[PDB]
Amino acid sequence: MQIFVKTLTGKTITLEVEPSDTIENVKAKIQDKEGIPPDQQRLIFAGKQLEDGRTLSDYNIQKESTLHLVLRLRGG
């Protein structure tokens, strides 16, 4: 299925995924395509934080869903 990932800069990344895929796996697809390291990536779905070890299915992320990619802050 297709999902979309909206970046901070306003780009929409388009991914081919399955409900069973982990969030970590989705981050890996983002990385190959946009060069964003997974350790920086934080995926959000309608305001909810998504966690690496959980799956798209766990969050009821279905076809044509849009996630938001935000970035970890690096505060001293």
In the complex, what is the shortest distance from the CB of residue 9 to another protein, in angstroms, rounded to a whole number?
11
Q: Are strands 2-6 and 66-71 parallel, antiparallel or unpaired?
A: parallel
C-alpha to C-alpha distance for 43 and 56, rounded to whole angstroms = 11
Cβ-based nearer residue to another protein, 32 or 73: 73
- State the minimum distance, in angstroms, from the CB of residue 76 to another protein: 4
Residues in contact with another protein by the rule CB under 8 A: 4, 6, 8, 40, 42, 44, 46-49, 60, 62-66, 68, 70-76
Backbone angles phi, psi at 33, to 5 degrees: -90, -35
